[PDB]
A paper describes a structure:
Here we present a series of TIGR03971 SDR crystal structures from several mycobacterial species which contain an insertion in the primary sequence at the NAD cofactor binding site. These crystal structures demonstrate that the inserted protein residues almost completely cover the NAD cofactor, only leaving part of the nicotinamide ring exposed to solvent. NMR experiments did not show exchange of the NAD cofactor, whereas binding was demonstrated for a number of small molecules which could be potential substrates, products, inhibitors, or artificial redox partners. Experimental results are consistent with the notion that the SDR family enzymes linked by comparative genomics studies to mycofactocin do indeed keep their NAD tightly bound beneath a protein structure that may interact with a specialized adaptor machinery for redox exchange.
Residue numbers in the entry:
A (entry chain B), B (entry chain D), C (entry chain A), D (entry chain C): 3 to 273
């Protein structure tokens, strides 16, 4: 496997893309430190939350590949507990090489329906949770002295833009900034830091009231409806496609790639 | 003048570039709604704070140009107070056409010296404050039915990156995201939203211990010393050079320009 | 007048945007060196060519503003004649401060209908002609020892992309590269070099004949139909709108701005 | 073998990165159509040209990997010959899946030492040769009806800029544009088109008088010396590092990635 003997720390691992990364990296020989909030999301979020049962299933899948996994229910906004969990994982698994900062939320809203609390919540999770993840993981990669690879999941919205969520777009741009900023200062440790920018991905972020919320928002400005048009026939990527790119970024075959924005969007950022 | 009969809402107006904008737009015929925190900055900020007296001196300068000014001591993180101040100002001056979201802080710090507090404070002011500013002002532009122009002050850091301030670079990227996102949804009201990206500017953001904080950070990674190198002979722009660009963006001579990132950096973002 | 005493060299001056630059900079007090091919364009170009009479009309409009103007029929691909025309102009007018490299062509074609000759003709005009223009003018700017300002006209296509003209998008990207490259080496002379990226502009390039060509190419791929969608209500800028931006770039009010890509596209490059 | 049963068409295959792509893709199970000028380079080029013997050695290595290879000495500027070579290769090998447009030249020169001939030569090769490559291969990928993957080799210069080669920088931006424009019209055939942007690579592009040419150009503007500074400790990548990224883009593990600019530059485009 491409990641034999390695240990990856992955947030938002209970389902969707985060589960896809855990499962892919375990298959490549990595042991896993997996976290998810596994509970209530901000009230502007229209789809269903993840559950402790979801995270148990990620655990089951990773063990079925014969790898060790340390999993915990924790909010990426809770820096002290996140730091504690990472330290407990590393003590247990012996090292840390890879961070995937994947936990995030989306909430379609017309600009003038976004309350201060709404803005705060999305920014807190998508940016501060992302910064907390690097801050919990990086000193443990540095201590090993082997170099490493940190992948921050941004969005197509964080390279170009996405309409009907001012907070989300801001937050995903902030993630681009976090990648370039952490890349510059962590590069002397041979730690690569890169951001990944998916278009629409087939995950439970499409569940609950998402379709309705998107539908309602679009009505407020129909001129903005083609911002996510791809060049390929596909509008939607599978979580495995994102895991493909993130696996490559984790692997030694991207050892010279850092500070980069990697789109996996069937071309829509150039549309 | 290029802004006869217009009204501009300018944040961070007590000194530096914010004062230069007020003075420049006043000279152009605009009445002003000016706000500043005029007091203690986050503990990670190494330079000196502004005072209420700094804000009064901006008031004097604008009145000396024979223009009207409404001014208030207010934190851009305080949405409730900011909306009230804007609403009273617009009631007093008759309309709103222009927003310059200019209040911001900088703090040189090694990445591993940024506490959760420091990160939060820089993010809250540079992003949340910026968002609060548009939210308080844009409805007043809309109701006038004339279109208008909103300028968000980002940084070179928000187009490329700047080392030794993870929070700052992330926040200024977020500001790029705010300008594109607000441009997309407000465009139907004929409201332009653009961001401006200065390199170093000759302001009191250079005051107190800033040069010291800079050298101390630079010491942690000398390889990063040349990120801000210009193509022109000059490393530093004057606040009036930034006012030059923001005035163009406020004027009817940029009516078709929106969602843009305008650098004023002597070429450094391409260095 | 913002350009009193200055001299500007403008290509593609016979009509459209180039004429609007001449007229505007004349109104601001500059004398003008104006050239145009004023004759046949490559066969892939679907709209009507300019004529000697068109250039003569630009001359009269410039003379009407009480300015001096040296005008000549010349192909920007003709490096020797372009250099002599500049040299003659500078001998007559005393100096050179400003370059607007505006001459260019557009040709909608399905990717597989572009012949080698078509690709060559579009590249030669849009890239080599632009490069010849800088090589003919920049030595005379340097000679004066006053600094100066060079504006290359690219396109939204050269920031993002435009479908159905592989040559044109490539050429306009080359223009972004020319600007950054010349900015880097000419900056030591205090010569700024920037690129300007219009969306659709209301000029003879966008004639009926063009519309037909655009419709034909579009039929080959309907999904690519919304690449030029604006955030503002207007899809088309006026040539005066572009002249507003290029004038600001020529003026001392942008003395710190170099290597920049300035869009005038109502938001479309972020759509 | 990530590429069993596939056929890749690779230009500049006699040595350096082109040979590394041939060798790697053959190891991954692909058969090869390989071309190289294998002779005289433009006179502005300071390093050593390749020879027919170099190309024969590439043939030797692919054959030793137990793969089939069709190789020819041909200039990418020659559309007629290049197309005929591709056609003979596809008649022999059965199909075409992958294109690596890698043939390119570099020439350090102060801006005012670039002759019209130097400019045209660098442009014809890096841009027209690249376009000719796609035009010769893409119809063949289309006729197979299986989708495919086109990788254009640009440079870090084509994402940011590189000093002391106006032509080179312009050509590599043009390559960025080509990737986007072709991605747009070929995506309906499930053909991805992407560009790859290396920083310095350890190849014979460093041979002959390259070191001298670089040092001499640098003397004309010492301010520009740090444009290629990395965030990682290494300034230089190996051709295998680039082959890693091109291999990934050729593979099914980047099936949703198109119109992307992929830097392999240790972070220098964000420096
Ligand atoms: N789905 C898309 O179309 C799409 C497109 C672009 C980007 N993204 C981004 O990709 C990432 C993966 O999301 P997904 O599509 O797998 O959606 P998902 O909602 O199925 O997965 C996200 C997971 O993160 C967890 N999470 C959310 N907030 C958290 C917090 N504060 N602390 C800890 N865990 C938290 C959720 O419980 C959930 O398990 C997110 O960063 C998202 O913004 C998604
Ligand atoms: N000076 C530089 O080198 C530089 C470079 C790039 C960008 N910028 C940005 O330019 C903008 C203006 O900065 P400046 O150079 O004039 O520095 P400055 O400190 O002189 O002026 C900033 C002003 O904003 C005010 N302010 C700060 N936080 C506030 C808050 N929460 N609420 C209300 N007011 C607040 C301060 O009191 C101060 O008066 C900032 O956004 C800054 O980040 C500065
Ligand atoms: N009109 C648009 O929608 C649009 C959009 C983006 C960019 N542009 C760019 O704006 C610039 C000006 O174009 P325009 O809209 O005024 O169109 P236009 O055709 O009216 O003007 C272009 C002028 O340049 C001249 N010209 C063309 N090739 C020449 C050559 N080799 N040498 C000398 N002169 C030459 C033409 O004769 C014409 O007078 C061009 O670079 C064009 O690519 C136009
Ligand atoms: N070496 C670097 O530092 C570096 C950095 C960034 C990008 N690049 C780019 O990478 C690519 C590969 O170059 P390399 O580094 O392996 O150097 P190289 O000179 O060793 O390889 C280039 C090969 O292309 C061939 N070639 C050149 N022009 C040709 C033409 N018109 N027709 C056919 N073949 C031709 C040359 O003969 C040579 O064998 C080029 O596009 C180059 O511009 C190189």
């Amino acid at each position: 496997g491409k990641l034999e003997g390695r240990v990856a720390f992955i947030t938002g691992a209970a389902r969707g893309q985060g589960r896809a990364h855990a499962v892919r990296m375990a298959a490549e020989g990595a042991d896993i430190i997996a976290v998810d909030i596994a509970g209530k999301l901000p009230s502007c979020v229209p789809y269903d939350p993840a559950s402790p049962d979801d995270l148990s299933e990620t655990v089951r899948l990773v063990e079925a590949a014969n790898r060790r996994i340390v999993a915990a229910v924790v909010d990426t906004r809770d820096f002290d507990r996140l730091r504690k969990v990472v330290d407990d994982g590393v003590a247990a698994l012996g090292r840390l090489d890879i961070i995937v900062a994947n936990a995030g939320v989306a909430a379609p809203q017309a600009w003038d329906d976004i309350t201060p609390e709404d803005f705060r919540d999305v920014m807190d999770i998508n940016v501060t949770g992302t910064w907390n993840t690097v801050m919990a993981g990086a000193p443990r990669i540095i201590e090993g002295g082997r170099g490493g690879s940190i992948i921050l999941i941004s969005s197509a919205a964080g390279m170009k833009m996405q309409p009907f969520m001012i907070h989300y777009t801001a937050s995903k741009h902030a993630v681009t900034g976090l990648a370039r900023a952490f890349a510059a200062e962590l590069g002397k440790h041979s730690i690569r830091v890169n951001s990944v920018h998916p278009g629409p991905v087939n995950t439970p972020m499409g569940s609950g009231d998402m379709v309705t919320a998107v539908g309602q928002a679009m009505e407020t400005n129909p001129q903005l409806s083609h911002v996510l048009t791809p060049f390929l026939p596909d509008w939607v990527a599978e979580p495995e496609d994102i895991a493909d790119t993130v696996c490559w970024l984790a692997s030694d075959e991207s050892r010279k790639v850092t500070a980069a924005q990697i789109p996996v969007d069937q071309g829509s950022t150039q549309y």
